[PDB]
């Protein structure tokens, strides 16, 4: 009984996809793939600097003025930016659905970087980065892509090195924006009480004009040591599928059964035929090994001893996720964005759901051999990380000598 | 001949297992060195890098 997600293209190939639902308030976004896989080592901040000079003002609506205007209808204004794909979206009421979508024209086309601007977001940026490292688990998660992808676009974080923010011009920004800004490789996504035929009218109105134009893993190891950390943050991995690759929905209730260190999140990252599987841990120093040991167990047992209860129990954690996610109009023209990018369709939940069910434990242990067991993983350890075992006793945790 | 023999009756049988011993371990050193050289690879390659926060 969920309503089926509408997608239209326009000529541009934009694709213009909408969701339409009671509620009063939409969030309306634009979704381009490009990120920090597409730079070139040149350019390595060029997305995340736009995306600071993306709200600085338009050549239409110069300055704050902008700004102004998403004030004035009281709307919120974020945008993000990952390894793969940007994102510009806006939450605002349903009446104010025309604006909105022109407001996100502006900011996707017609855009105006300030020389002056530039200087105070590269301030910003460099200060934030200066600052950032504050943040362990970014600091973690990075190492943990650099190491695994080592040699790659995916090894380089989307912030870029400090080197690169500085070193950075207007006409470089003009090239990335001019470049991985093309209008096939663009989704309008709109989600709650919009109709998709006037979304469809607005995007033919505007937003018509946006031009028509070995990724691997490395196992390895990265040791920031500094001890003078609290606590110690470590992410293990290994390569996961891919986002078309469809065991990702029985790994993902693998991390269900998974859910001794003071933090234990799992994670299944993934980009365009690759990703990072894996755990990420917090923990004091005199700990760390006897997590490692518990965890590999863990998964271990999801490789040899997996029962049907646990399968049960993870089926149940995934299905009330992803239904108790796409819940906000957000959540879900997020998740339309995403789906249009990288599917190329939106999923469902019904397919989730019939994808869900048909899991079982003999192939939940079965793919679960196929990504975990006798795999080279990549470690990134930071803080207190003396007792946290070098690769030789992981890469030996990755196995059991009696299956 | 005959008295070497006598105060080594073995030395032939001794002959043979030496040549099965060089044998073996002509087989084994280079394996076990091999071993050793991949579980000792790691740190040889390990690089170590000074970030004082500056």
Same mark, same amino acid.
């Given at each position: ?98 604006? *909105? *979508? ?302 | ?54």
């Amino acid at each position: 009984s969920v309503p089926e997600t509408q997608v239209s293209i326009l000529d541009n190939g934009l694709r213009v996809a909408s969701e339409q639902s009671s509620h009063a308030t939409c969030t309306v976004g634009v979704w381009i793939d490009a990120g920090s896989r597409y730079e070139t080592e040149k350019n390595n901040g060029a997305g995340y600097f736009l995306e600071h000079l993306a709200f600085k003002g338009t050549k239409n609506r110069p300055g704050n003025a902008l700004e102004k205007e998403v004030e004035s209808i009281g709307a919120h204004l974020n945008a993000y930016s990952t390894r793969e794909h940007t994102a510009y979206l806006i939450k605002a009421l349903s009446k104010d659905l025309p604006k *909105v *979508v022109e407001l996100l024209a502006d900011i996707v086309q017609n855009s105006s970087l300030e020389d002056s601007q530039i200087e105070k977001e590269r301030d910003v940026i460099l200060r934030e980065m200066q600052e950032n490292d504050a943040s362990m688990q970014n600091v973690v998660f990075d190492y943990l892509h650099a190491t695994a992808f080592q040699g790659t676009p995916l090894a380089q974080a989307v912030e870029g090195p400090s080197e690169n923010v500085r070193r950075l011009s207007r006409t470089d920004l003009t090239d990335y924006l001019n470049r991985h800004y093309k209008a096939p490789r663009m989704v309008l996504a709109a989600a709650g009480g919009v109709e998709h035929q006037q979304l469809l009218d607005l995007a033919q109105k505007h937003l018509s004009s946006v031009s028509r134009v070995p990724c691997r893993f490395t196992g390895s190891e990265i040791r920031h040591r500094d001890d003078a950390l609290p606590l110690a943050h470590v992410a293990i991995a290994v390569e996961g599928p891919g986002w078309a690759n469809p065991d990702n929905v029985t790994l993902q209730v693998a991390n269900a059964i998974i859910g001794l260190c003071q933090s234990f999140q799992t994670f299944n990252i993934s980009y365009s035929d690759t990703g990072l599987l894996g755990a990420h841990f917090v923990c004091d120093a005199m700990s760390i090994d006897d997590m490692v040991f518990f965890l590999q167990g863990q998964w271990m047992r999801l490789c040899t001893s997996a029962t049907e209860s646990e399968v049960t129990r993870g089926k149940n954690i995934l299905r009330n996720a992803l239904v108790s996610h796409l819940d906000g109009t957000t959540p879900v023209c997020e998740d339309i964005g995403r789906s249009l990018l990288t599917y190329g369709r939106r999923i469902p939940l019904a397919e989730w759901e019939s994808r869900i069910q048909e899991v079982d434990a003999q192939m939940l242990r079965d793919i679960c051999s196929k990504y975990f067991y006798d795999q080279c993983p990549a470690v990134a350890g930071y803080g207190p990380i003396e007792q946290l075992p070098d690769y030789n006793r992981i890469r030996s945790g990755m196995f059991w000598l009696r299956f | 001949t005959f008295l070497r023999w006598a105060s080594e009756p073995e030395h032939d049988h001794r002959k043979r297992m030496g040549l099965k011993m060089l044998l073996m371990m002509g087989l084994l050193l280079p394996l076990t060195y091999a071993m050793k050289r991949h579980k000792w690879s790691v740190l040889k390659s390990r690089k170590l890098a000074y970030r004082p926060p500056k």
